[PDB]
Protein: Capsid protein
Organism: Adeno-associated virus - 1
Amino acid sequence: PSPLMGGFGLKNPPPQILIKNTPVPANPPAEFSATKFASFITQYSTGQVSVEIEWELQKENSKRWNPEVQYTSNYAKSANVDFTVDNNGLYTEPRPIGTRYLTRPL
Amino acid sequence: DGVGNASGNWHCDSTWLGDRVITTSTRTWALPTYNNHLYKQISSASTGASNDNHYFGYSTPWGYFDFNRFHCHFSPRDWQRLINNNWGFRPKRLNFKLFNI
């Protein structure tokens, strides 16, 4: 049961955190009406969210002699730096980065 | 410790601790007889060199042990591991052993 998109398949994954604004009704009528409220005060909310994950690592223990393939930035004069913002303030990721760079014997 | 007993083992390894790395290197050496066990005075008089290349000195019958290069201690993989991950490094201590004569 490993997900086909990649990642960790969990029987009990991190649960969903669900959030909503509590409805605030607008001015009710002077006389009672059993029809459910449809007029609400229009509002939104803003805030800060923090997520902290501890990850366990499994270190390489290789006896390989020659140097390994590593993920590296390209050294060259470029109009922009990779994984940065442009002059308009837009953060971009130039390429997808995988994980499989170190090697081990089969 | 005797003719039929080895006086040391092959210790060629590299151990990475949190802030230390210990590199061990064993090599096999051959030492000849130099100068027929003689001390000889050497100079540039027979060479006939220029004034900039003149010298005077001595050649001894001794050899010396040299491990003053980084690849005597680091494999290329260990060197890459050091330089891709550390902002600096320096040597703390060393042990030298000569065995199996």
